[PDB]
Design an enzyme around this catalytic site. Structure first.
Site: not given
Ligand SMILES: CC#CCOP(=O)(O)OP(=O)(O)O
Ligand code: SF4
Length: 309
Positions: A12, A74, A96, A126, A167, A197, A227, A269
């Protein structure tokens, strides 16, 4: 065996920005660059940056005086930000922008002394950061994860109450929490739907479409990525075997033996090189050309701060 790719999948805007923030810091200032928490929850990204001199810590007390410190994507609590501020540290913030938006609402409620409820997963960074924007002892800040949590919550003044969300939740499970919040607290104020998001919403929609076609879904993502876990869970609830994998070495042949259609997606990610190597491995196991599914187009980019160009 047919290989289908979900669309959208993988990085993202906030994750691409955060990674670029650490790489550019490394290129501008040299190693070491300290990073508070995994910059994003991906083992390959974090190992890559570590091998180039980033040092990931959990607590500011692990960072030396005079060091450059980056906050992960986060976000961080006011206490953490104040601790870095009271120290000798040069700080860059890779939070973010879509997490900071939620933090500003929690700050607003704290200043008003009006209680807030966050929907999110206990111990996730987060949620720590977002709960950590609330400081007013006269109000309150509460976490709920499920309708059951809402059914047990008591607050000081339910006529002045707002809600926020993490998010990277399940859109569907969050919707059931919000329905409970509104039944329990009819005067509660929030966003139209949630703070989930665009990237989380879009990859859940995309994996739904993928699981409709595929017998087995592989989600490229680390175990601690919320996510990415939500994408696997979504496919499992549609009755498909789904596996959360870091890379191609994780693929067990039995999972795809005799499977006619295998679907691959990636969390927000996970870098595309991991998906490419997964597809190569599925092709060793009998797969053909990877076919991308038609998807909702994404167009948002978040730039690195000017200080780090
Ligand atoms: C900040 C942020 C983000 C999206 O990826 P991530 O690092 O895997 O975070 P989550 O554990 O919140 O999904
Ligand atoms: S998953 Fe969404 S809120 Fe988290 S870093 Fe990515 S765009 Fe930003």
């Amino acid at each position: 065996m047919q290989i289908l790719l979900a669309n959208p999948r993988g990085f993202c805007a906030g994750v691409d920005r955060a990674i670029s923030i650490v790489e550019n810091a490394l290129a501008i200032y040299g190693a070491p660059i300290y990073v508070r928490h995994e910059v994003v929850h991906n083992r390959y990204v974090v190992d890559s940056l570590r091998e180039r001199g980033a040092i990931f810590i959990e607590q500011i007390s692990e960072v030396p005086d005079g060091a450059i410190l980056i906050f992960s994507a986060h976000g961080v609590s006011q206490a953490v930000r104040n601790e870095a501020k009271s120290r000798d540290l040069t700080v860059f913030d890779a939070t973010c922008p879509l997490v900071t938006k939620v933090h500003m609402e929690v700050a607003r409620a704290s200043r008003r002394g009006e209680e807030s409820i966050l929907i999110g997963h206990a111990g996730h960074p987060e949620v720590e950061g977002t709960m950590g924007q609330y400081s007013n002892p006269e109000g309150g800040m509460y976490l709920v994860e499920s309708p059951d949590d809402v059914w047990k919550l008591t607050v000081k003044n339910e006529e002045k109450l707002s809600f926020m969300t993490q998010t990277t939740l399940s859109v569907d499970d969050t919707s059931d929490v919000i329905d409970a919040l509104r039944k329990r607290f009819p005067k509660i104020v929030g966003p139209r739907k949630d703070d989930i998001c665009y990237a989380t919403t879009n990859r859940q929609e995309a994996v739904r479409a993928l699981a409709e076609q595929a017998e087995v879904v592989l989600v490229v993502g680390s175990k601690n990525s919320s996510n990415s876990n939500r994408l696997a869970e979504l496919a499992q609830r549609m009755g498909k075997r789904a596996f959360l994998i870091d890379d191609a070495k994780d693929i067990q042949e039995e999972w795809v033996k005799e499977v006619k259609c295998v679907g691959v997606t990636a969390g927000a990610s996970a870098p595309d090189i991991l998906v490419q190597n997964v597809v190569a491995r599925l092709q060793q196991l009998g797969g053909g050309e990877a076919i991308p599914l038609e998807g909702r187009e994404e167009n948002i980019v978040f730039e690195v701060p000017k200080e780090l160009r």
